[PDB]
Amino acid sequence: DIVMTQSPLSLPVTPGEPASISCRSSQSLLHSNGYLYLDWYLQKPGQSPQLLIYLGSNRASGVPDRFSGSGSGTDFTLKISRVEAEDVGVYYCMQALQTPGTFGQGTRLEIK
Amino acid sequence: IQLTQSPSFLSASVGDRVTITCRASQGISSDLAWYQQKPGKAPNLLIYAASTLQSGVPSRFSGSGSGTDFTLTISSLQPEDFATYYCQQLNSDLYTFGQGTKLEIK
Amino acid sequence: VQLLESGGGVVQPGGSLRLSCAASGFAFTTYAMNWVRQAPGRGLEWVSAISDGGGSAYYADSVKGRFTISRDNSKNTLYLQMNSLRAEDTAVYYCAKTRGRGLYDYVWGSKDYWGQGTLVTVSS
Amino acid sequence: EVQLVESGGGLIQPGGSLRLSCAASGIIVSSNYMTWVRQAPGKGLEWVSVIYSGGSTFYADSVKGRFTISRDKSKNTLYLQMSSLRAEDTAVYYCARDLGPYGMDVWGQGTTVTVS
Amino acid sequence: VQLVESGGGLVKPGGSLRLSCAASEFTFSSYSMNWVRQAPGKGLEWVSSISSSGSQIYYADSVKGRFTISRDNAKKSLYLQMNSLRVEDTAVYYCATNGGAHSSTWSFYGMDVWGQGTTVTVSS
Amino acid sequence: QCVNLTTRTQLPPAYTNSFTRGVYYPDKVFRSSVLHSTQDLFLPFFSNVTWFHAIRFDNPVLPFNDGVYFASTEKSNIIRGWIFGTTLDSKTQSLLIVNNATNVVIKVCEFQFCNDPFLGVYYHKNNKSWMESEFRVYSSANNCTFEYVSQPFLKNLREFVFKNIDGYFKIYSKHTPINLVRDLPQGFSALEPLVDLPIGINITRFQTLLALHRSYLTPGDSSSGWTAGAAAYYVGYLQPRTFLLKYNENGTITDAVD
Amino acid sequence: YELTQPPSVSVSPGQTATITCSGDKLGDKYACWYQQRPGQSPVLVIYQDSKRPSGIPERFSGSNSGNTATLTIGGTQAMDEAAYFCQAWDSNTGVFGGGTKLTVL
Amino acid sequence: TNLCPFGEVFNATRFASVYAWNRKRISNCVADYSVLYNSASFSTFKCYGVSPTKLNDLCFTNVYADSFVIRGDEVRQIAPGQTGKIADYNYKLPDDFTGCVIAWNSNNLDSKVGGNYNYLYRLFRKSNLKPFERDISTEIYQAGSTPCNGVEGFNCYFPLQSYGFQPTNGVGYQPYRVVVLSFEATVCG
């Protein structure tokens, strides 16, 4: 298994500010073909998970302009450029490289 | 297929919720696309497959409908959002455009 | 794109259930589908994934052997048969379609659209 | 990154000819559904011609037997060979790229063709 | 023939490996091939087998869905694609020739030629 | 597959004498007691017909000039078919006739025939009368059009006449229990038609398909113990001649003169 | 399908060994036998329950009957110390025994 | 002895997609062509070899029965010398075609409330198919200079697109089952 460790587990943010999330992978998630096989999911309270970012930095469809991902090899970062009153909820990183798909524990985002 | 848009001329204030409808003569079932054209500029694709937003278009544009009636909804009007909007029949061989709604910021 | 799931409810430890995901509004013959469960207050864990037309089916090690995944492409229905259910399977189960269809767009990879989840409650 | 640049329009007398260009950077012309779309002054869009990736071409009935669409695979360029231009051909032409179920996503800036 | 395995090396669990078995002569076309592994302190364990034409493939239940055997009689070589590697997959892997052409004949012969195996280590 | 057995055996061919043999019904016309003179392809009387015996069984590709006469002594089912064709390779369709024990399979594919095509034979100890036949005839066989299944064609002498006329592959057969010591008998027998397959291919060469047992196994040879039983098969060649075929009252050809 | 072998057998040099293999109706199938010296590749010594490959001495004699397959090494020599593996097929799936070691004192 | 299987092709509950079109070779039987020409249920019956009423009095070396589903607006392209997405990238009739094509509206079967996404046509290809070429490959189509690396994205498209058949569709966009008999002497009436 590829253990994925997130940080922080809670992230109190005043809306309008920028926010960052991190994911450490025990393997190198690089180049099944040249990409970084890591996805970011947001689960809103009481909703189903929705894809945010795939292959490290590529935004999924319908995802606003502020959700940008980064990082190569083992260190990956989500950056919400400006937090709004609707981004609260848990965020999961995920390795999409090997057939046991491990998520993170889930950075819960809230409002200060 | 004779595509008809309505209304042809429109006016609304900033922040108003605007609904634009393009009517299909027979029924195409998703095969519509929505374009925006500024005065003197090139058309910008907004919504392909009659509901799916093209990448880079703000999430305040929503498309709806299937078959005969389709709708372009701007969930919040903007002062730069004045242009002419066109529907197109996708997956057709005449590439049928509409006449075009000239949306105007009141 | 719609993913409506059937089945789910209350069963007995060691019993067997069947989960059905009904896909509409997209091809589903050219996509790979996932099952991801979430125990109450524990977070997402992957369960199984199947390829475009069956054949390639992958399972999480904690369900390997007990759970079987299958799809009926004429019915556009994704199935998951639960066997010998434990008390550690109490979770809300989501079907999820893979985002891409290329080679190295892995059947277990990015999940574009999820369902609303059906709860499975092993209890007595 | 992805751009279509058009050039070659101008003033031309009725019955005469003119060729339009479409320089594509990023997009392979020889692998795409490349179209030409025109818009008369103060009027709506109107599809003119399309060339498939395989080599098939098609034309609007208002244009058949006059215009000819063609591509140069070496320079990654698209041509629309106009001929016998009537006064109803006074329009601004855009070379688009068509994707079928996906719309015409990329567009050129436009070339304005006058008739007098 | 004389068989020579290659391709076995250290790999982390979940990783992948591809072994190779090149035959000395071209009589390799007349042989069903078998893969056999040997855990470092245990007995021989049959993994998979392919027939002379390649139309008849059977695996062990412990590798079904993960290992994929193949051959190319034009290159007189045998292959094993080894995906979703587990720790219990560490072993010395032998390639052996049956002698029978089809599965209906495998039981009439023994694995008469054995290439010196290749060591596969699967460790975190 | 394709284990090759033709190591070095290069004996010069031997000829027996097909006394009065290979006289088939060259027609579908019933005739009463009448001496009808036919002019078709025939195996001439008292001709030298080449003999193939186990000595084991060089079994080479033979010319299919205008049509062949095939005989076998074969007290055990060891002759198993033939692989008529032009190139006996890919890119050219070839004809394969194989019968197991209760059924005959005919196929016209682009076979990639081995250099020494034959069928392995094994009897499982659980049920001795098994004859588990393994194919070592072709390595690839695909993209084909004709596939016909019927009851099997086959000291129990058997006689065959193959000919390829205007797109048809015509087979005439006659199976006879025989007491004579080694060679073809003397009693006149008239072959009669089995099948007329609309194969429509060009045939210039043919080879017989044998059934070999594995007597022992050296670890790597694949050519170790392929014993070939004990049989003999004769290939004659049909020449265009004029016979005088005496018909019986019932329409059987009791006699002929060259 | 399973095959059962005794972990070890020990015989003095010059004696005769007997390595046995048991399985559910193993006598209705063919049982191969392999000899593996310490740290070497296995060598087939008995196939089809009685037949040896060419080059295998005639003292390697095997038999199969009922649910038991036995291998017999008459005149056991010091060169015979090796593990021995019973082998069979079951619905086109190969099956090896546990592996009987043979210690020639 | 018995008829050639003209009920297996014209009456199957399940046809294929135009990209992966079926083909059945028909040989060594007797064909009752009178079940087709006098059926009164076909929208298209256009023959390019010999006359349809005069069909079961000619013997042929071999017969093929290609069958698939397309829009009604694209039956135009199932003919020799035609062009379009179906003709270029899905099914190409040789311009020396001997045989004929049979199409009949199947909106009652192949259209589903809310779309029927099980039928696919190939939309992206570099070059046109050869006559009677089949193409069932699904590699990502590089519509740009950048290599795709097997990742469907921008300028890298999955080549198959789905007919969204809907019972509300116009008659040109409704599904049409198509059978394309080709002739090339083992079969006749």
Coordinates of C-alpha atoms in Angstrom, one line a residue, chain B residues 1 26-30 66-68 89 91-93 95, chain H residues 71 73 85 117 121 164-166 168-173:
Chain B
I1 CA -33.8 21.9 -38.7
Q26 CA -37.7 18.9 -34.8
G27 CA -35.7 17.8 -31.8
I28 CA -31.9 17.2 -31.5
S29 CA -31.8 15.9 -28.0
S30 CA -28.5 17.4 -26.8
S66 CA -33.0 18.4 -24.2
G67 CA -34.8 17.7 -27.5
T68 CA -36.8 20.8 -28.6
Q89 CA -26.7 22.4 -33.8
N91 CA -23.2 16.8 -34.9
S92 CA -25.1 18.2 -37.9
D93 CA -24.0 18.7 -41.5
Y95 CA -23.8 23.6 -39.0
Chain H
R71 CA -28.8 7.8 -37.7
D73 CA -29.6 11.3 -41.6
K85 CA -18.0 10.7 -40.9
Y117 CA -25.7 5.8 -25.2
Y121 CA -19.5 6.2 -34.1
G164 CA -27.8 10.0 -27.8
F165 CA -30.8 8.3 -29.3
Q166 CA -34.0 9.7 -27.8
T168 CA -38.4 12.6 -29.2
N169 CA -35.7 12.9 -32.0
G170 CA -36.4 14.1 -35.5
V171 CA -36.7 11.4 -38.1
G172 CA -33.2 12.3 -39.4
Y173 CA -31.7 11.7 -35.9

